[PDB]
Amino acid sequence: AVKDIKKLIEEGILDYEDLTENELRKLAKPDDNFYELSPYASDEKDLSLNETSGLTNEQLKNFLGQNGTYHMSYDSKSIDYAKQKKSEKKEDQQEDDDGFYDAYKQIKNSYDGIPNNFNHEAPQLIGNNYVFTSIYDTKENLIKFLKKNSEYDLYD
Amino acid sequence: AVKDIKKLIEEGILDYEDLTENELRKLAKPDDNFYELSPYASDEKDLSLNETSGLTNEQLKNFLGQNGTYHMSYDSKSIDYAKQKKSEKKEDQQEDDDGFYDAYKQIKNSYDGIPNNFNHEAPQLIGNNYVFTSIYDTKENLIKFLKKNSEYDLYD
Amino acid sequence: ILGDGYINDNHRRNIDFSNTIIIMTSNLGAELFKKKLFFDADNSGTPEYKRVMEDVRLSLIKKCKKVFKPEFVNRIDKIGVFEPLNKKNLHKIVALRFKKLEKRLEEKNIQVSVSEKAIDYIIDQSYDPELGARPTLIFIESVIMTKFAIMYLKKELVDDMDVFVDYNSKAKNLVINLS
Amino acid sequence: ILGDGYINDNHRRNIDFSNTIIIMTSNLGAELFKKKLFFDADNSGTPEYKRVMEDVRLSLI
Amino acid sequence: GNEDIIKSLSDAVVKAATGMKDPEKPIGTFLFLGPTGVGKTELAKTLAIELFNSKDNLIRV
Amino acid sequence: EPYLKIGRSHTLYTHITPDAVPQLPKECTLKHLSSYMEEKLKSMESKKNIESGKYEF
Amino acid sequence: EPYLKIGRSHTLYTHITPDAVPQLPKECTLKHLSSYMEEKLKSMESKKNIESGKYEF
Numbered sequence: 001a002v003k004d005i006k007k008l009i010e011e012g013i014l015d016y017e018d019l020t021e022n023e024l025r026k027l028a029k030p031d032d033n034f035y036e037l038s039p040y041a042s043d044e045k046d047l048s049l050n051e052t053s054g055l056t057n058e059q060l061k062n063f064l065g066q067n068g069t070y071h072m073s074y075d076s077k078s079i080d081y082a083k084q085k086k087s088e089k090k091e092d093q094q095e096d097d098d099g100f101y102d103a104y105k106q107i108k109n110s111y112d113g114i115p116n117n118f119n120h121e122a123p124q125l126i127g128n129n130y131v132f133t134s135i136y137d138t139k140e141n142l143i144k145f146l147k148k149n150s151e152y153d154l155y156d
Numbered sequence: 157a158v159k160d161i162k163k164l165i166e167e168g169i170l171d172y173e174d175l176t177e178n179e180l181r182k183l184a185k186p187d188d189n190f191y192e193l194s195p196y197a198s199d200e201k202d203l204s205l206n207e208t209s210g211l212t213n214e215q216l217k218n219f220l221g222q223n224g225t226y227h228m229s230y231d232s233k234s235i236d237y238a239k240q241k242k243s244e245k246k247e248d249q250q251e252d253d254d255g256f257y258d259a260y261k262q263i264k265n266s267y268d269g270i271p272n273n274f275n276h277e278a279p280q281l282i283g284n285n286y287v288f289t290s291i292y293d294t295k296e297n298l299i300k301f302l303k304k305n306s307e308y309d310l311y312d
Numbered sequence: 313i314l315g316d317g318y319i320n321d322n323h324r325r326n327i328d329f330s331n332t333i334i335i336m337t338s339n340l341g342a343e344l345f346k347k348k349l350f351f352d353a354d355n356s357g358t359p360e361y362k363r364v365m366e367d368v369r370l371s372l373i374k375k376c377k378k379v380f381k382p383e384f385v386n387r388i389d390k391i392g393v394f395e396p397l398n399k400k401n402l403h404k405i406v407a408l409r410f411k412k413l414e415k416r417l418e419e420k421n422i423q424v425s426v427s428e429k430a431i432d433y434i435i436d437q438s439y440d441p442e443l444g445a446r447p448t449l450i451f452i453e454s455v456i457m458t459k460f461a462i463m464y465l466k467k468e469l470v471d472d473m474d475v476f477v478d479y480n481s482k483a484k485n486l487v488i489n490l491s
Numbered sequence: 492i493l494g495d496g497y498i499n500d501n502h503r504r505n506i507d508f509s510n511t512i513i514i515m516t517s518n519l520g521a522e523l524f525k526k527k528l529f530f531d532a533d534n535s536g537t538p539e540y541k542r543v544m545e546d547v548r549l550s551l552i
Numbered sequence: 553g554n555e556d557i558i559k560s561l562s563d564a565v566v567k568a569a570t571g572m573k574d575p576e577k578p579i580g581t582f583l584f585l586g587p588t589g590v591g592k593t594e595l596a597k598t599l600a601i602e603l604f605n606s607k608d609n610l611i612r613v
Numbered sequence: 614e615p616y617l618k619i620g621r622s623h624t625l626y627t628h629i630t631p632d633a634v635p636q637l638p639k640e641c642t643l644k645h646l647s648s649y650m651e652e653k654l655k656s657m658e659s660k661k662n663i664e665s666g667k668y669e670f
Numbered sequence: 671e672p673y674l675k676i677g678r679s680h681t682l683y684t685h686i687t688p689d690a691v692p693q694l695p696k697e698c699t700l701k702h703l704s705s706y707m708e709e710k711l712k713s714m715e716s717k718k719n720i721e722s723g724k725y726e727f
């Protein structure tokens with residue numbers, strides 16, 4: 001009151017209401033694990049990118065633009081092709097569950113500004129200020145404080 | 157007379173004819189299993205979606221629009237291709253039941269407003285009121301009562 | 313064997329399976345005993361969670377006939393389907409272990425008692441509906457049972473101690489001992 | 492065995508099977524017919540669907 | 553390294569030398585996994601030096 | 614019998630409305646035949662190899 | 671109940687704004703249901719290999 005001091009005491013003693021503008025902005029500043037050099041990201045199934053996607057055909061977009069008595073509104077060539085591969089691989093034993101946990105995970109990281117394999121700190125605009133959140137350091141109590149107190153108030 | 161009280165007594169004692177407007181609407185209200193959080197739906201063969209489907213070609217729709225002396229009225233490219241796969245998979249042992257049992261389960265759910273893998277409560281407009289029916293709680297006696305008695309009558 | 317009591321051998325002797333209770337177990341539990349169809353067995357149903365079990369028990373007999381070559385569906389008398397464990401049951405199922413536990417301590421005469429709040433501290437920190445309480449019984453043996461002997465190594469256990477387990481909801485962590 | 496009686500052993504002596512009613516049981520109907528308009532037929536069709544069972548019987552052979 | 557593994561070794565001995573739970577299950581089965589290089593065998597060679605003070609109670613199969 | 618009379622009749626097809634078509638009886642629809650299978654196939658399994666519940670007397 | 675009232679109502683679809691649609695309660699969103707899985711899953715993965723020494727009496 002400095003940054004590592006707040007992570008222990010503000011859970012026990014200090015409320016967020018009695019903190020200055022130079023103290024709130026530095027807890028939203030990135031930590032010292034940021035600016036630490038880290039190679040070798042761990043690859044996973046990217047739910048962001050769609051391998052079954054295709055290109056705008058412009059004759060579908062013309063025919064679907066003229067609204068009326070059409071019965072299917074996409075191409076279904078690449079998305080049937082994809083389903084045939086899952087019928088032919090015979091990969092079941094962890095694909096029954098690795099994806100399920102992952103969807104819930106990577107989906108929650110989308111509400112924090114964090115992409116798929118991003119094990120580091122990513123910002124999130126709350127009001128007029130950015131808050132760098134993590135996979136581990138979610139900083140949820142700062143988010144509940146800055147949304148509720150600084151709705152009609154400004155603390156940089 | 158409350159909601160769980162009616163499920164035991166109205167089969168034995170109480171008729172549906174002596175029930176107030178605040179009592180009929182709450183038995184058609186969803187149960188406490190609704191608003192209970194339930195992940196992990198169980199996938200099955202979706203009879204709703206047709207994998208053998210295709211797109212409106214607009215030269216067939218023009219040629220079939222001009223009525224007269226045509227002998228086939230669809231495309232038959234994606235359908236034939238599908239029948240060839242069933243000849244080549246050699247999957248028989250339970251698929252002899254899958255086309256022959258499982259539709260009855262999903263076809264009857266189409267008369268109740270319930271989709272394929274939907275193990276929860278789905279509404280159904282009867283007259284001017286909605287009735288939330290289930291896979292298990294069919295609520296058939298409410299449906300026979302609201303159609304017959306409230307045809308020219310209104311009970312919210 | 314499930315058909316009749318007899319089977320021959322290479323002697324062609326009469327093997328008798330009468331007066332032998334024959335018990336067939338298997339899992340077949342994935343994709344329906346999951347979080348699939350079974351969130352919140354807290355309530356556990358006087359009229360309702362019966363009915364989910366009134367089709368989950370049906371859905372296994374679908375997989376009984378189509379996996380086992382359904383003559384077992386003819387030969388077996390009673391197909392027993394277990395309900396998932398309730399947290400209201402584990403208040404005593406865990407307590408059923410401490411009576412077996414003191415049989416290994418009745419030599420030493422340590423009597424061990426566990427609060428109901430202590431059980432709640434265990435279940436919420438060891439149990440899920442998906443693993444079926446085996447690691448919770450590892451949680452006893454590999455966490456709490458390890459230091460009862462460490463309470464005995466250093467001389468804090470008199471050979472008559474009324475061990476009373478409790479948690480006073482601070483995430484503080486105490487064993488209340490009486491002589 | 493079904494063709495002949497005279498069957499040598501591993502002592503290579505003949506073992507007769509005359510006056511022995513040989514009975515051959517197997518299912519070969521399981522998980523493949525399952526209605527044939529018939530398991531929903533307790534009346535079973537007295538002049539009509541008996542001919543179906545004959546065509547069921549013919550198929551098994 | 554790996555004090556959490558070493559505690560799990562010590563705890564089974566605390567289950568052993570104190571008359572704690574010993575059914576027909578042997579005390580402390582262990583499955584060690586790691587990259588080639590790290591202290592996977594020579595935990596156990598130090599056990600025979602320390603649990604038995606002999607080094608000839610070590611049975612390499 | 615009623616569907617062959619309107620079929621053989623000299624009426625234009627634009628005059629054939631759902632008011633003019635007589636309804637099938639309740640034995641002859643998909644609503645009966647799909648619900649009758651759950652009277653068998655749900656029931657068929659709920660009394661095959663299962664006979665402890667609700668055989669009280 | 672509030673979503674069927676506006677659905678059955680005779681209002682033009684251009685008048686349906688996000689101001690006119692009532693919000694779902696907090697039990698019914700993806701923000702709850704995705705965070706509730708990390709209350710299970712993340713907690714669950716540690717149910718294997720429960721820590722020796724982390725719970726001291």
Ligand SMILES: Nc1ncnc2c1ncn2[C@@H]1O[C@H](COP(=O)(O)OP(=O)(O)OP(O)(O)=S)[C@@H](O)[C@H]1O
Binds near residue numbers: 553
């Ligand atoms: N913590 C340590 N203390 C002392 N010596 C160690 C330590 N870690 C490694 N060593 C040495 O490195 C080797 C470790 O033995 P091992 O665990 O057998 O190594 P390893 O190369 O992984 O072979 P493995 O485990 O059988 S595949 C020995 O030669 C030790 O002298």
